[PDB]
């Protein structure tokens, strides 16, 4: 059949790509950094505790002033907190109970949320009246919304469970570019500092690099076993990290197009829900299903600290822009701030 | 200066007002029963009804895909799951339904939820697909319908026990199964749902006090 020859040509191309990557592999990251010394001992304690929500919590996001943050819960509420003084500011009731993601605008004038209704809703905070009401609704996805990240006040990028990603125009309300490369559901995404490229992880155990302007995939990163749950991007601009259900984190390099590190331990069996980096890119923090977080070391791959003290599953994780605080959420209704 | 105290007072007043609203919201939220409806906005559906001044709120998932290993974890804190089965060439849908039931029963985040089972289209209603419908006998305690068809009754009580085996093979102590035959048509299903919900709630408290 004509399908067989095309398949064998694809296999030959895959073999050529694998050989090209194998040729460039001169040394490992461990050997180069074997000379440096360990970070030491890192211990953190809970400085603040927030007790507003009723049901479990799925998402949170930090503000660019590193003082306000929004959180989403499955009872149908959005709450904006003040991190310095534990008092709330806004409480926003949602039309649909199951919200699965939330984002905070860089300017501080908008927030977003989405869930099983397949719709993304934009909320206006600063208004003449003084209340909060929906501005726009973005329909068109054929699957539940799972992540959204503001690019500016007029643009946003979303991922859903119909194996596609889209770029929206808020005032127009119509899709502009669609990225159809994945096979399974898309779980998370992360934007670059210059907001020119971004990466996503799906349930096909693969990650991709997208071009916002052109609109087609440039690189595909493989080598993983199971579904990818979280993804974060490195401060420099040439690396990113992933987390998944096989209890393993990995480090990838855009300019080298290869995997560089693996963060796994023998007694760790549960999955990974969220990952994040530190300000200098030296500490890699992650959340697990065993109710506590871990602090890794990106250059040497050894465990330095542990963030315990949660009564249920940890779902979200975040680090401030100035890097002076860390906030975590969990399936119990409490938020903790660590420093 | 004095403006700082004014800002703090305003912030505390706003906090007090929103806490006062959340108190009423909490009182309203925890007196409602949430049910999930399975089978075999466009994304999600809603439905409200009341029996004996009790609030129910059922959810139908008809806008999603057929890969449900990810969005099914959002229903781990519901009261019960309603599972509709068509008891009637075919493609052996009974085995597919049984496998889905087994997966739901054995899932980690749904390993404590009860299931209410509804067999439908008894009027329309085994020997080729299942080679054990020949050494089976009708259970001693049975209430046959006035139809009195021996083959139909035998098929009914062979299908019910097939689902009961999965439920009794594991998950012993903290969840159960309530099978019903949909002989009643018009409005007798909601009364049954009410009864099972009441039983589940009573058993939950008794288990919490360790009297069962």
């Amino acid at each position: 059949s004509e399908l067989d020859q095309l398949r064998q040509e694809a296999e030959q191309l895959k073999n050529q790509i694998r050989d090209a990557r194998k040729a460039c592999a001169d040394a490992t990251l461990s050997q180069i950094t074997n000379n440096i010394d360990p970070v030491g001992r890192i211990q953190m304690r809970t400085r603040r505790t927030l007790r507003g929500h009723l049901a479990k919590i799925y998402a949170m996001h930090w503000g660019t002033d590193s003082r306000l943050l929004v959180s989403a819960s499955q009872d149908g509420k959005l709450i904006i907190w003040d991190s310095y003084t534990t008092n709330k500011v806004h409480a926003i009731p949602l039309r649909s109970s199951w919200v699965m993601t939330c984002a905070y605008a860089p300017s501080g004038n908008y927030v977003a949320c989405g869930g099983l209704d397949n719709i993304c809703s934009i909320y206006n905070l600063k208004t003449r009246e003084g209340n909060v009401r929906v501005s726009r609704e973005l329909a068109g996805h054929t699957g539940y919304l799972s992540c959204c990240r503001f690019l500016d006040d007029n643009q946003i990028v979303t991922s859903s469970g119909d194996t596609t990603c889209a770029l929206w125009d808020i005032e127009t309300g119509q899709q502009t570019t669609t990225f159809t490369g994945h096979t399974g559901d898309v779980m998370s995404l992360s934007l670059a500092p210059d907001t020119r490229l971004f990466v996503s992880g799906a349930c096909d155990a693969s990650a991709k690099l997208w071009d916002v302007r052109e609109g087609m995939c440039r690189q595909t990163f493989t080598g993983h076993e199971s579904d990818i749950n979280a993804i974060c991007f490195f401060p420099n601009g040439n690396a990113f990290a992933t987390g998944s259900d096989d209890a393993t984190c990995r480090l990838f390099d855009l300019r080298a197009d290869q995997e560089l590190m693996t963060y796994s331990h023998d007694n760790i069996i549960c999955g990974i829900t969220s990952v994040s980096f530190s300000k200098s890119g030296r500490l890699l923090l992650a959340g697990y299903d065993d109710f506590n977080c871990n602090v890794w070391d990106a250059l040497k791959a050894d465990r330095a600290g542990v963030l315990a003290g949660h009564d249920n599953r940890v779902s979200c994780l975040g680090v401030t822009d100035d890097g002076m605080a860390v906030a975590t959420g969990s399936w119990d209704s409490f938020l903790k701030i660590w420093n | 200066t004095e403006d700082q105290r004014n800002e703090e007072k305003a912030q505390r007043e706003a906090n007090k007002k929103i806490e006062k609203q959340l108190q009423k919201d909490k009182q309203v939220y925890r007196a409602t029963h949430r049910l999930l409806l399975l089978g075999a906005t466009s994304g999600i559906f809603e439905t409200k009804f009341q029996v004996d001044k009790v609030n129910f709120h059922m959810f139908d998932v008809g806008g999603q895909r057929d890969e449900r290993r990810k969005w099914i974890q959002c229903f781990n804190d519901v009261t019960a799951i309603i599972f509709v089965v068509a008891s009637s060439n075919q493609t052996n849908r009974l085995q597919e339904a049984l496998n889905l039931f087994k997966s739901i029963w054995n899932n980690r985040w749904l390993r404590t939820i009860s299931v209410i089972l509804f067999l439908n289209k008894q009027d329309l209603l085994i020997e080729d697909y299942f080679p054990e419908f020949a050494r089976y006998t009708t259970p001693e305690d049975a209430t046959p319908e006035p139809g009195e068809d021996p083959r139909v009754t035998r098929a009914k009580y062979f299908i019910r026990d097939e689902f009961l085996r999965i439920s009794t093979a594991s998950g012993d102590g903290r969840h159960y199964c309530y099978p019903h035959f949909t002989c009643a048509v018009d409005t007798e299903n909601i009364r049954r749902v009410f009864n099972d919900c009441r039983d589940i709630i009573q058993r939950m408290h008794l288990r919490q006090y360790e009297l069962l």
Partner: nanobody
Framework: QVQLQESGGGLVQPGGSLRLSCAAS????????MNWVRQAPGKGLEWVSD????????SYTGSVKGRFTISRDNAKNTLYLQMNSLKPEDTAVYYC?????????????????????RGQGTQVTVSS
């Protein structure tokens, strides 16, 4: 990358015997549970059988119960299916698949072709 490749499909008259196998790579074989899946012409996907991590637990679909058997080799990362006394009804395309999560007793893999962790299959036909 996860990859599966089946082999051993061939035409056979009624009463014959066939042997099927698929070899896995790119993941730890011992940590996952395997299945067998068929697709009849003009009909949807149908689950056939499954085997536990250590091979202790075995299940069958009822139509083929008592005629098929399944075994796995952890050392060589290979799955086997033994077929005896075939009939013209058995003609279909056979797939071997695994469920996505390790250390789990529940799997969701009888879905459409969209399932990523599946092979390509070999044609098996019975006629005269």
């Amino acid at each position: 990358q996860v990859q599966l490749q089946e082999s051993g499909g061939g035409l056979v008259q009624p009463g014959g015997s066939l042997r099927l196998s698929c070899a896995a790579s790119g993941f730890t074989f011992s940590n996952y549970k395997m299945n067998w899946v068929r697709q009849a012409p003009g009909k949807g996907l149908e689950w056939v059988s499954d085997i536990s991590q250590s091979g202790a637990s075995i299940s069958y679909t009822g139509s083929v119960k008592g005629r098929f058997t399944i075994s796995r080799d952890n050392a060589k990362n290979t799955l086997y299916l033994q077929m005896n006394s075939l009939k013209p009804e058995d003609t279909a395309v056979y797939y071997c698949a695994r469920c996505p999560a390790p250390f789990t007793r529940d799997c969701f893999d009888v879905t459409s072709t969209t399932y990523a962790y599946r092979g390509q299959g070999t044609q098996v036909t019975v006629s005269s």
